[PDB]
């Protein structure tokens with residue numbers, strides 16, 4: 001059997017995030033009513049069922065700008081975008097409802113599950 | 123502090139690899155003598171110093187085809203591309219030399235070290 005590098009996935013992830021913070025190869029701008037977020041489409045698709053369906057759409061595949069539902073709050077989206085790239089979720093009793101609703105919309109099932117844990121713990 | 127999802131990086135990587143095997147959003151063809159490999163530039167850049175330097179070159183940035191040193195054997199490159207996307211390295215006394223040299227060329231330092239320990243072990 002293959003040697004298994006248990007640290008490889010999170011090294012790739014950390015470099016993807018360094019790519020993003022230096023804006024290298026980012027190929028999409030996510031629009032949330034007024035606010036803008038630069039990302040890599042494959043990372044978005046690897047993290048969210050919604051992005052998977054969007055960029056798997058023959059029509060929408062080649063857009064450089066994607067509008068999401070403009071009722072999404074942008075803070076909740078921002079928290080979720082940093083999570084995608086860092087595996088770290090900034091959850092608090094001050095944002096929990098916003099972040100959870102945005103994760104449901106984005107179809108990020110692990111995050112919605114942990115949000116249910118957090119509600120039940122506090 | 124932020125809740126840490128210790129399984130996130132590896133679920134992203136497993137979906138990046140499902141994207142690859144369905145050919146979704148692959149945006150580069152790697153040419154290895156005669157053989158062709160499809161991949162996503164950001165994953166190559168996240169995993170290899172060589173691809174980091176290639177796709178960060180303003181001149182080579184937008185190329186859909188990358189030709190590598192024709193002296194690289196394709197089997198050693200193929201094992202290393204699967205590793206990037208799965209974290210599993212198929213190393214054996216039958217390919218160790220090819221894999222190690224291709225890892226050095228691609229500037230994948232963690233793989234190179236492991237190969238060194240594999241040599242030391244047998």
Ligand SMILES: O=C(O)C[C@H](C(=O)O)N1C(=O)/C(=C2/C(=O)Nc3ccc(Br)cc32)SC1=S
Pocket residue numbers: 045046047048049052137138140141144
């Ligand atoms: O069986 C199917 O046809 C796929 C099935 C679906 O959409 O019907 N599915 C997915 O592929 C989902 C994905 C996801 O959330 N991130 C991802 C990254 C790469 C790939 Br390929 C898929 C997903 S969620 C879902 S259901």
Ligand SMILES: O=C(O)C[C@H](C(=O)O)N1C(=O)/C(=C2/C(=O)Nc3ccc(Br)cc32)SC1=S
Pocket residue numbers: 054060063065066067068069070
């Ligand atoms: O082409 C683009 O720039 C964006 C693209 C589209 O319409 O093809 N798009 C949307 O507008 C999307 C929405 C969504 O998911 N929920 C929503 C609620 C209200 C409104 Br108005 C829009 C959406 S998802 C998507 S892709």
Ligand SMILES: O=C(O)C[C@H](C(=O)O)N1C(=O)/C(=C2/C(=O)Nc3ccc(Br)cc32)SC1=S
Pocket residue numbers: 015016018019022167168169170171172174
């Ligand atoms: O100091 C610097 O400017 C960076 C330094 C360099 O090129 O001089 N360096 C890198 O950024 C290297 C990377 C790599 O192998 N995969 C990667 C993914 C994302 C990012 Br950002 C970097 C790498 S290897 C290297 S040396």
Ligand SMILES: CC(=O)NS(=O)(=O)c1ccc(Br)cc1
Pocket residue numbers: 114117118121125126127128
């Ligand atoms: C779900 C996750 O990433 N981690 S966790 O299981 O350790 C967890 C975190 C916070 C609360 Br409150 C309850 C559980």
Ligand SMILES: CC(=O)NS(=O)(=O)c1ccc(Br)cc1
Pocket residue numbers: 123124125126127
């Ligand atoms: C410290 C630890 O074991 N895990 S953790 O960092 O993911 C964490 C869990 C719950 C909260 Br509430 C805040 C942090």
